[PDB]
Design a protein around this ligand. Sequence first.
Ligand SMILES: N[C@@H](CC(=O)O)C(=O)O
Ligand SMILES: N[C@@H](CC(=O)O)C(=O)O
Ligand SMILES: N[C@@H](CC(=O)O)C(=O)O
Ligand SMILES: N[C@@H](CC(=O)O)C(=O)O
Lengths: 316, 318, 317, 318
Amino acid sequence: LANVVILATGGTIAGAKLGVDKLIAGVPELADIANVRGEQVMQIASESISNDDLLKLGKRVAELAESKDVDGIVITHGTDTLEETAFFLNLVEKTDKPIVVVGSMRPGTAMSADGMLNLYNAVAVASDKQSRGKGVLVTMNDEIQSGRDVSKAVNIKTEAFKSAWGPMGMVVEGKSYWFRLPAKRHTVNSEFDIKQISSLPQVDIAYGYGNVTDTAYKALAQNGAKALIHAGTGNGSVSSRVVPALQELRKNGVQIIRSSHVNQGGFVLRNAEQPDDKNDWVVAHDLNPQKARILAMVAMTKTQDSKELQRIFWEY
Amino acid sequence: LANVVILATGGTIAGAAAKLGVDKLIAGVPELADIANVRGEQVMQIASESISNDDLLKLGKRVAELAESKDVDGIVITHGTDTLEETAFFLNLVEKTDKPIVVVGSMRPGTAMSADGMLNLYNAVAVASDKQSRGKGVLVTMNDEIQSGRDVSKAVNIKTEAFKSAWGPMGMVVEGKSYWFRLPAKRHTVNSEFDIKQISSLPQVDIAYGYGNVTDTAYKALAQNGAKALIHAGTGNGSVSSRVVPALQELRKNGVQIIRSSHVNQGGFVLRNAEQPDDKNDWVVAHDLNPQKARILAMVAMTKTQDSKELQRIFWEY
Amino acid sequence: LANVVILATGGTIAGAAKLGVDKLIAGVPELADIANVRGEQVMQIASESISNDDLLKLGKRVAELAESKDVDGIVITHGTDTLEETAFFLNLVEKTDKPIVVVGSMRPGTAMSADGMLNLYNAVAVASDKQSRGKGVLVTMNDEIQSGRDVSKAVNIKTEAFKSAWGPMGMVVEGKSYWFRLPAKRHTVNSEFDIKQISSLPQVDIAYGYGNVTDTAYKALAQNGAKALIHAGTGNGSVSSRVVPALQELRKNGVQIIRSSHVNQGGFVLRNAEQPDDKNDWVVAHDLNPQKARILAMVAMTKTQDSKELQRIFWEY
Amino acid sequence: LANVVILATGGTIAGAAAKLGVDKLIAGVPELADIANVRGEQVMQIASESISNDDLLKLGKRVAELAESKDVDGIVITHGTDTLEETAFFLNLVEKTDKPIVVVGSMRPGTAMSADGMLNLYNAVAVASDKQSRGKGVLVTMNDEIQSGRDVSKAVNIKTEAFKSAWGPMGMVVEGKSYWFRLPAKRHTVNSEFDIKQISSLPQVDIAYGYGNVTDTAYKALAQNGAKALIHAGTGNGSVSSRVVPALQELRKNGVQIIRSSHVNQGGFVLRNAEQPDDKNDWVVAHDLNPQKARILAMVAMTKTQDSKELQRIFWEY
Ligand SMILES: N[C@@H](CC(=O)O)C(=O)O
Ligand SMILES: N[C@@H](CC(=O)O)C(=O)O
Ligand SMILES: N[C@@H](CC(=O)O)C(=O)O
Ligand SMILES: N[C@@H](CC(=O)O)C(=O)O
C-alpha cells in the first residue's frame, strides 16, 4: 500500500478543534487504501493564515517530498484560503510526488458531513500513480481539480470548488478518472523552489468598483505592499480617477497587477483596457485576485522586472 | 407601438469606449422602427469603470423624469458592462415605476466582427416595449436573456455571455419576443421604500478584500477617507481574519457600518452569526449580494437609516 | 409544529430501495425538532422502472393527504432517475397550496458522507414552511429549493445532480428557507388539470435524433400504441430529411408530434424555426426536455386532442 | 502564412440553412487574408440534422487527403451545429495527423443582426494556422473558446454559447491568438488505433431513450432494422427499466452490443457494474460520453472489434 502523510492545518474539516489523529480515526477505511500517518502542522481557521504559516507548511511539505518513506502528501485545510495554499504549493514544491489539499463545507458532526469522503478521496489520489507529476490537486465533490485555478466559488454547498477550465478528473470508489491534463507550469517544471525561499514579499489586494478612490492602493503601499493586485471591474479596468495614483505607485516601485472580480471565465488581456506597456503594469491573465497575489509573492522572490512578471503570469 | 426612450451613458456598445452618440447608436439598428417609436438622449459619455456617484445620481434623476412623463412607455439605458450591474441594481432600488427599465451593454464595439451590440439594443427595446416587462423591476437583456438588474453580474470576461445570476436568467428574448420562466422574489421599483425623488446625495461606501495574510490597513484608511460603511469582500462565508476583527470592532464603535460580503460569487450566501458574531459586533451580512452590489444597497439604504437592524432587514428583503 | 407525511417510493435514498419508511424517519431523529412526521410506504421501486400506474397511485394518495385537515405538508422520497418526471407530474395535477416536496439521494445512507439524511431533513423543513405554500412542487437536494417543473437530473454521481436551466428558486440552510425567485409557469392550484379526474394516462413514447437516424423507432413506437411521440431532436428540435415523411403520416393518422431536444442546459425549441409546425400540425416542447415533455404530453391529452391547445399548454406549464 | 483549407458542408453558418457556397463564406471574412492563405472546397451542402454515415466517410476521406498534402498546414470544416459534435468526435478518432483540424458553425446566419459566423470562422482559421493547435486533436472554436471535439456538445439552444464540455474549454481565442489552459487526456488523432485510410463503411449503430413507462419496443425494432449496437440513453447512471433488461439480454445473446450512456449530460459518468451487472450481461458503459457521441465511438470501434471487453477498453481510453 502507498505511504501517505496527512499534514493537518485546521479548517471546518477539523470542527478547527480536532487533531489529525482524530481526523484519521474518523475515516477507518483509510487503512484499506494507504499506510497513513498524521502531523499537526498548525490548527487555524484558514481566513486567518499568515505568510509565516505558508512558508512553514511549504518547508514541511518539501521535507516530506524528499523522504523515500513518503509516496504522497495530503494537506487538510480550511476551505476559505484552500485555493491560495494549493496554488502556492503548486509553484514552489519541485516534486512529482502527489500533493492533495482538501477541506470540507460541513464539520464531521453535521448531518451529511462531506469531510469523511473528501479525506478518503484525498488519500486515494495521494496514493494513485496517475497523480504523479500532475501538480497540486484538490479532491472535493468527487472531482480532481487543479490547485492552480480551482477557487471557492459557491458558499455553503459541497460543490464550493470550481475552475473556469473544468475539473481535470473525478474520484469514485477510490478510483481516479482523468479527462484533462494541466497546460501551465507547475512543481517539477517550476522555476521557483521553497528550498531557495526564506521570506515572501508583501503583496496586498485592492477592490475596483464604481466611485472607487485611490485610498486603499496608497495606504496599502505605505504599509508595506511591494505589489498591488488590482481586483478590477471587467477586463481589469481602472477608473480614470485612480490611473494617476497607479502611475505614481509604479514609479514609486510598486508592481501594478490587473486582475478582476469577473471570476467565472475569460481573462485580462494586456494593453486592452489600459496601456500596460506604456505604464509598466502587468495583467494577471485568468488568475483571480487572491491567486494573482500568490503568484506575485512567489515571483518577486526571484525578480522585480515587470517584463519577467508578465511572462510568469503567462506561464503559471 | 410603445414610446421607448434610449438614455446613452457610453460603454463599449458606443465604442469605436464611449465615442458614438445615441443618434448613431439608433441609426445603426434600423429595425428598431418596427418594434417601437424610439428617441435618444445622451445623458453622459463615459467608460463605466470611471462612473462617479455624481453620474449615478444624475442617471437616476433623469430616469425618474422620463418614467413620470405620459409620452414614455419604456426606458433603455445604454451602458458600459464594467459597472452595468451596479447601475442596474441602483435603478432597481430607487425608480418607483412599473414602466420597463432595461440596461444594456455589449462586450464588443459595433465596428468589431460579430459585434453583440445591435441585437442587444434591439432586444432591450423589444423588452422595454413589452407589456410583460411592466412591474418586473430593472432588467438586463444581453446574450438573448432577460436577467434581473438585482443579482445579474459581469462574471465572464471577453465572451458575450458575460452576465450571469446565481438564481438564473428570468427569461429569454428571441426574434423580438419575451419568454418568462421565473419572477423576482425581492423588493424592487414600485414596492421599494426608497425613491430617487427624495435622494439627492449618497453616503460614501467603500470595499476592502479578504485573503491570506491580509491586514486592517485598507479598512482603517478607507474609514479615515470618509467611508460610512465598509463592505468586507471576505473569503468564504464573509470570513474575517483574527488580525482584522479588532479594527472592524473599533470602526463600528466609531459609527462605521461593517457589512460582510464575499468573493464567493457563483452561489450561496453569507449567513448571519455563522463565521462572525454579528449580533455581538452589531455587523450586517450582505446575504447573496457580491461586494459591489452590497455597496449600492448599503449606500441607498443609509440615505434612510443608520440602524444596523434595519440595514440587515434591507439586506434580507432587497 | 406542522404535520408532515412522508410517502416512501424507493430509491437510493432508501438503499443498503431496501429500507422501509419507518427506518428512513428513525435515521433522521432531528425530524422531531421541526415537524410531526408520519410515514407511509406507497411502493418500493428503483425509479428507472417506474410506470404510469405508479404515478397515478402516488398522485391519488398525495391528493387524499392534501384534502385532509391533519396534513400540513407532504414529502415523497424517490429514486433520483425519474424524480424529475414525478415532480413535474405532481406539479401539473395536484390542486393544493399545501407544500409538496420530492427528494432522493445520490448515495445510500450506508455510504461515507451520505447526502440522504440532510436531504430528508431539508425536505421536511421546506414542507413545514409557510413560505412553501402556493410555490408548486419543490425538490430539496444540494441545499437548494428547485422547481419540480424544470429541475432535471443533469450531473451523474455528484450530490449537485439536480439543475434547472432557470436556476434554483431558493436554498434551505439549517432548516430555514431563503427565496430568490418565484415560479412563472402554471402549477398546482392554477392548473387546469386535476389528478381527481385522471383514471389512466395516454401512452407516450420518446425517440432520439442523431446522425443517420431513421424513421424506425418512431413507427415501431406508434405501432405499439404511442398516442404522441416526443422527438428528442438534435439542436432546435431538428428533424432529419429521412424522418419528416414518417412523422407527417403519423400526424395524419392522429399521433401527436412534439419537438423536444437533447440540448438541455438552456434555451428552448422555437415553433416554426427548424420545421414548419403550423403546416404539419406539430407541437414544440418549449424548454422542456424529452422526459419532461412526455409528462406534459400525457397530462395535456387527458383534456384535449387539438394540437393548437397542446401548443398553448406547452407555452403555459 | 499557413495554408488553411475550409471544407464547407452546410449549416446555419451558410444560411441566407446551407445556401451560401464556401466562396461567399470566405468573401464575408476579408480579414482571413491577414492570418492565412485560405482555399476552399464545397464537400456537401446540408442541414447537419440530415447528415448520413456516407456524408461522414466522404468528409473523413477528404480531410485525410488534405492532411496528407504537404501544401496544407491546417483544415477548417464549416458545419451545421446540430451534429457538429458527432462529426468532430468522428474526425478526432479516424484522422491520424498532428495537423490542426477545426470544426466550426454558427447559431445565427450571417444576415442576422450580431451574426456569430464571421468571428467563429476567423477564429477557426486562426487556430488551424497556430502551431499551438498541432497535436491537440480536433478542435471546436465557437464563443471565443477552444473546445475538444471529443466531448464538446450542443448543450444550449438559441444562444451563441451553445457548445459546452463537462471538462471545460481547453482554451480561448481572442484577437486571433490562442491561449491554452488544459490539454487532452484521451486518445486522439495520431495516437488513435483507428484510421479513415482503413475504413470503407461503418456498422449501423442506433439510439434509444430511457424514461418512465418505457418499453423494449424501440430497442427491438432498431435491432430488427439492422442495428449492430444499441446506445441506451438511460436515466441516471445508465439505468435500465426492469421492463427492458430481458429484451437487452436477448439482443446481446443475438450478437447486438448494448452500450449504457445517459441523458445526464452536464457531468459525471456511467460507472461499470453500478446500476446494471455489465460483466454478467456482457454489456459496455459509455463512460462520460453522451448517447450521440457513444454512437460515433461504437461505430468506429466496431470496424476493428466485436469483443465487448475491447469495446469497454476503447470507451475508457477515447
Ligand atoms: N472558516 C473555515 C471554513 C471552512 O473550513 O470551510 C476555514 O477556512 O478554516
Ligand atoms: N470598459 C468598458 C467595457 C464595456 O462597455 O464592455 C465600459 O464599461 O464602459
Ligand atoms: N436507480 C436509483 C438511483 C437513485 O435513486 O439515486 C433510483 O432511481 O431508484
Ligand atoms: N439546422 C442547422 C443548425 C445550425 O447549423 O446551427 C444545422 O445543423 O445545419
